[PDB]
Amino acid sequence: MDHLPIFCQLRDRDCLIVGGGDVAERKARLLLEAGARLTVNALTFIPQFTVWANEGMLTLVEGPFDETLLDSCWLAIAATDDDTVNQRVSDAAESRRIFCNVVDAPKAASFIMPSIIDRSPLMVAVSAGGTSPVLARLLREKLESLLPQHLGQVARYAGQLRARVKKQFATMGERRRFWEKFFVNDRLAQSLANADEKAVNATTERLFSEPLDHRGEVVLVGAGPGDAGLLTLKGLQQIQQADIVVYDRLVSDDIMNLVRADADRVFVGVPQEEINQILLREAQKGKRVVRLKGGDPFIFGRGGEELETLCHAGIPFSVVPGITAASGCSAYSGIPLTHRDYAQSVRLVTGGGELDWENLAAEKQTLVFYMGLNQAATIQEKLIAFGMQADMPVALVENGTSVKQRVVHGVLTQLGELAQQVESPALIIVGRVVALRDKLNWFS
Amino acid sequence: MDHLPIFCQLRDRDCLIVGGGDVAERKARLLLEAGARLTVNALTFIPQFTVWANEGMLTLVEGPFDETLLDSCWLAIAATDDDTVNQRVSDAAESRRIFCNVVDAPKAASFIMPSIIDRSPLMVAVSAGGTSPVLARLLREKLESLLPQHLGQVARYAGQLRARVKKQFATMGERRRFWEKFFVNDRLAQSLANADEKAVNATTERLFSEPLDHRGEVVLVGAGPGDAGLLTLKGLQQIQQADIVVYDRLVSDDIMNLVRADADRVFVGKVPQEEINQILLREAQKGKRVVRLKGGDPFIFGRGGEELETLCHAGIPFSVVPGITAASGCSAYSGIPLTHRDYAQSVRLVTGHLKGELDWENLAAEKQTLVFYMGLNQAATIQEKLIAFGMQADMPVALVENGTSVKQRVVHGVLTQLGELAQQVESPALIIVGRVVALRDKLNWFSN
Numbered sequence: 009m010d011h012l013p014i015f016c017q018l019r020d021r022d023c024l025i026v027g028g029g030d031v032a033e034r035k036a037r038l039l040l041e042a043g044a045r046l047t048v049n050a051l052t053f054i055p056q057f058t059v060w061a062n063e064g065m066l067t068l069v070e071g072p073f074d075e076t077l078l079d080s081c082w083l084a085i086a087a088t089d090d091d092t093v094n095q096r097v098s099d100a101a102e103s104r105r106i107f108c109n110v111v112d113a114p115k116a117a118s119f120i121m122p123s124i125i126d127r128s129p130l131m132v133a134v135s136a137g138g139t140s141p142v143l144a145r146l147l148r149e150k151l152e153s154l155l156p157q158h159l160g161q162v163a164r165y166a167g168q169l170r171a172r173v174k175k176q177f178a179t180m181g182e183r184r185r186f187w188e189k190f191f192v193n194d195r196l197a198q199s200l201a202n203a204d205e206k207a208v209n210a211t212t213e214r215l216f217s218e219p220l221d222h223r224g225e226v227v228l229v230g231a232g233p234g235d236a237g238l239l240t241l242k243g244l245q246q247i248q249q250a251d252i253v254v255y256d257r258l259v260s261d262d263i264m265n266l267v268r269a270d271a272d273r274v275f276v277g278v279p280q281e282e283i284n285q286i287l288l289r290e291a292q293k294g295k296r297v298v299r300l301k302g303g304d305p306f307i308f309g310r311g312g313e314e315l316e317t318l319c320h321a322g323i324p325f326s327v328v329p330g331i332t333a334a335s336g337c338s339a340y341s342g343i344p345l346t347h348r349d350y351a352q353s354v355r356l357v358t359g360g361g362e363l364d365w366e367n368l369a370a371e372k373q374t375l376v377f378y379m380g381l382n383q384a385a386t387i388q389e390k391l392i393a394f395g396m397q398a399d400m401p402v403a404l405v406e407n408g409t410s411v412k413q414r415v416v417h418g419v420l421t422q423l424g425e426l427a428q429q430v431e432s433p434a435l436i437i438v439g440r441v442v443a444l445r446d447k448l449n450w451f452s
Numbered sequence: 453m454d455h456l457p458i459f460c461q462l463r464d465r466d467c468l469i470v471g472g473g474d475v476a477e478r479k480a481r482l483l484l485e486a487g488a489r490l491t492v493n494a495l496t497f498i499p500q501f502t503v504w505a506n507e508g509m510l511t512l513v514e515g516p517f518d519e520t521l522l523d524s525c526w527l528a529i530a531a532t533d534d535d536t537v538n539q540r541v542s543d544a545a546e547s548r549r550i551f552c553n554v555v556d557a558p559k560a561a562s563f564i565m566p567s568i569i570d571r572s573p574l575m576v577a578v579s580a581g582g583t584s585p586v587l588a589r590l591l592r593e594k595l596e597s598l599l600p601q602h603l604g605q606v607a608r609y610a611g612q613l614r615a616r617v618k619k620q621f622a623t624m625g626e627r628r629r630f631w632e633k634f635f636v637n638d639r640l641a642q643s644l645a646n647a648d649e650k651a652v653n654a655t656t657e658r659l660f661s662e663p664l665d666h667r668g669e670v671v672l673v674g675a676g677p678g679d680a681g682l683l684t685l686k687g688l689q690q691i692q693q694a695d696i697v698v699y700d701r702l703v704s705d706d707i708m709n710l711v712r713a714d715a716d717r718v719f720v721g722k723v724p725q726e727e728i729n730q731i732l733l734r735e736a737q738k739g740k741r742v743v744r745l746k747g748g749d750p751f752i753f754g755r756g757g758e759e760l761e762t763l764c765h766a767g768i769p770f771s772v773v774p775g776i777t778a779a780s781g782c783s784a785y786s787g788i789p790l791t792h793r794d795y796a797q798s799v800r801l802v803t804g805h806l807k808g809e810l811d812w813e814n815l816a817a818e819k820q821t822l823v824f825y826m827g828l829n830q831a832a833t834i835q836e837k838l839i840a841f842g843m844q845a846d847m848p849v850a851l852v853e854n855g856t857s858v859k860q861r862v863v864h865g866v867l868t869q870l871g872e873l874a875q876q877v878e879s880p881a882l883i884i885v886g887r888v889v890a891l892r893d894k895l896n897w898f899s900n
């Protein structure tokens with residue numbers, strides 16, 4: 009072992025930073041967030057320090073490095089661009105047995121600052137001794153994506169319940185299993201975060217009442233339009249905690265690979281009624297069910313209908329929104345849905361009853377047709393017949409955001425022509441913003 | 453932050469443990485692996501301390517607590533079962549400004565020892581501060597089943613190459629690009645774990661030979677509507693690796709905590725558009741990875757087109773990471789789906805304040821959900837115009853303030869109440885008009 013990680017209590021402990029530039033500013037933010045009684049000594053200071061000083065958050069000492077400033081200090085940081093000053097600081101700290109970091113020379117003095125994932129009171133720290141800061145940030149990134157934002161509130165509450173769980177769960181197998189469902193209970197975490205103290209007390213007693221077997225709940229998760237990177241952090245966390253994942257064709261294979269093989273998978277790509285009962289049945293057997301749907305669950309996803317089935321049965325649910333096809337395709341095709349005065353509104357529209365064509369034909373809109381390929385010849389002839397100018401730009405985006413994305417574009421009088429040239433899943437975008445693609449297309 | 457994690461170099465530094473039982477032994481073992489010069493002061497010692505002392509790996513002092521034994525120490529650990537003694541140790545260490553752990557009292561004294569996942573020289577440390585040692589242990593096992601055991605050898609080889617990387621690559625960006633390739637090369641990791649130095653050298657030689665692009669980049673990243681969990685995985689990657697992050701006030705606080713700690717951050721809240729464009733242009737022309745972090749989605753009422761056309765006109769590369777737009781986030785978190793069955797044919801995302809003006813006949817049409825962005829100040833005009841162009845007076849409306857955050861507020865009513873409803877909230881807020889608003893009483897799962 010090269011270094012021993014320790015977690016220091018710095019509240020109201022004198023710490024010293026030498027330096028007043030951006031390096032020192034980054035270190036000082038860290039120590040302020042830890043509650044240090046912070047002094048900063050530098051020949052000059054950047055404006056952020058005077059701001060902190062005027063708010064009484066720290067003390068500034070302008071001038072050359074003064075070793076007597078280390079007199080009552082617990083930690084020192086050398087954060088200048090001058091190697092002779094940093095060596096003076098680390099030498100004075102060493103002789104006082106004060107742990108010291110030289111920012112630009114991690115093996116020069118006595119401690120290294122790791123990458124930190126803060127879920128206080130829960131904290132994770134990653135370092136490799138300065139041999140590989142890029143690896144440390146790469147690992148920090150994975151951990152940040154995995155650890156729910158409000159886990160620390162759950163950790164705090166867990167400690168207050170340590171006594172109750174022991175008196176109810178005899179063996180450590182049992183309370184280990186209790187703690188495992190406790191730390192993944194979404195209703196509890198959001199109830200703690202929202203300061204809804206009655207939902208806390210309801211969730212708390214429901215967690216003690218039900219069998220350890222039962223963790224029944226459904227999460228509707230929007231998987232985004234295809235690219236696995238367009239899943240949300242919460243969405244990834246939910247599919248990592250699922251007992252059962254119910255998905256269909258419009259969920260990309262790259263998304264499905266982020267589900268651990270330890271979860272049951274149920275493929276329902278079958279009228280809507282059957283899907284509703286599947287979710288019902290598996291939530292009532294007490295499993296964590298994630299219903300994965302393409303894009304956003306509440307935008308032509310029939311997501312509402314599945315949740316109404318669950319409401320009439322008393323099964324907790326939540327929804328994780330996702331990137332709808334329009335947003336994904338817009339960003340990845342270089343076609344902004346709005347721009348300057350081009351469009352006062354964006355219309356997301358499907359392809360008994362039928363569409364209001366005069367309304368769709370009006371100016372200053374971006375039109376986005378979902379499930380519109382089969383009707384694309386109709387859409388061309390009717391938009392023209394209802395006054396939309398023949399030179400209106402149109403684009404069709406197929407498999408948007410994925411490695412198979414194809415974009416075709418022209419004007420409206422060639423819209424029906426370009427539509428047989430693509431296949432589902434495809435969006436039809438009509439409007440002046442379509443012209444912007446020649447400049448903004450950064451993708452395939 | 454409850455604690456500040458630091459990684460201490462203990463080689464040849466005096467450390468004191470008080471106590472000689474099984475707790476002290478566990479801590480002594482750790483401090484010996486770290487290379488500490490270790491004294492153990494205790495009334496009695498379990499046999500393992502005899503084994504260590506015979507080998508000359510530490511100094512035993514048999515007797516009650518000797519405060520003067522702290523005088524040259526960098527760390528102290530109180531590991532007795534006597535809380536009077538433990539607190540004398542903590543007090544003596546405090547006066548000397550020596551960080552001190554009381555093992556049976558995490559909240560007392562001045563450092564805590566975390567759980568350690570060892571892939572030396574790579575190390576991960578986890579602690580919940582004694583609030584939930586069960587959580588720390590569950591997390592410690594997940595981290596174990598996540599970090600490959602190859603990883604220590606990749607990190608060790610990186611350490612050996614750092615001098616050559618600094619010599620051969622002039623700029624900081626080049627060195628970063630090298631390391632970013634180095635750490636994801638699976639063949640190199642396999643060859644290191646196999647001690648196949650022929651393969652190690654050939655892959656390494658090729659890595660050093662690749663042209664490294666020096667161009668700065670600008671990434672437009674949608675931060676989503678507030679909740680940090682609604683950032684995309686790709687958006688998180690970009691802000692974890694940017695040099696500079698240019699962020700609005702419509703980017704929540706929790707999102708900014710996800711920026712890498714050593715990134716520079718430039719505020720552009722309330723500055724006009726051509727201020728922002730130029731700030732991006734220049735830091736990008738400095739060869740730095742720039743992330744432009746905007747609320748919601750960058751291409752929905754975000755003015756992301758204008759910033760990018762300036763960079764295209766100047767030869768600067770760029771990309772766009774979409775985000776959850778306010779309509780989708782507030783929809784999910786208020787229990788108001790934007791489409792549903794027969795209710796809504798179409799969703800309209802509309803801006804509220806503009807220059808000619810809005811096409812109210814168009815907006816008043818039945819079977820749609822209207823979502824007004826930036827429309828608070830015109831709520832009275834919206835109600836009057838939609839009524840005048842034939843929308844039913846009892847049409848449900850909702851206003852979502854600070855959607856998806858812990859401060860989210862929802863008010864709802866009918867169209868004839870829209871103007872007064874808007875006075876009960878402030879920016880940032882959405883106006884939702886449509887029959888789907890009535891679904892809230894069955895689909896609301898978040899709060900109120």
Ligand SMILES: Nc1ncnc2c1ncn2[C@@H]1O[C@H](CSCC[C@H](N)C(=O)O)[C@@H](O)[C@H]1O
Pocket residue numbers: 233234258301302303304305306307308309331332333334337377378379380405406407408409432433434435
């Ligand atoms: N990756 C993709 N590229 C282009 N269009 C897509 C797409 N994924 C879904 N779509 C569109 O969405 C339609 C299915 S309806 C479901 C839409 C989803 N809830 C969402 O928010 O996007 C398809 O007919 C297609 O037009």
Ligand SMILES: Nc1ncnc2c1ncn2[C@@H]1O[C@H](CSCC[C@H](N)C(=O)O)[C@@H](O)[C@H]1O
Pocket residue numbers: 677678702746747748749750751752753754776777778779782824825826827852853854855856879880881882883
């Ligand atoms: N968290 C939130 N809750 C409610 N409305 C929000 C919001 N965040 C942004 N908005 C809306 O967005 C308007 C700014 S326009 C910026 C919109 C952003 N690009 C997006 O895609 O959502 C605000 O006036 C408000 O109407």
Ligand SMILES: [Cl-]
Pocket residue numbers: 112113114115116138
């Ligand atoms: Cl160094």
Ligand SMILES: [Cl-]
Pocket residue numbers: 135136137138139140141142144
């Ligand atoms: Cl490192």
Ligand SMILES: [Cl-]
Pocket residue numbers: 498499500501
């Ligand atoms: Cl022993």
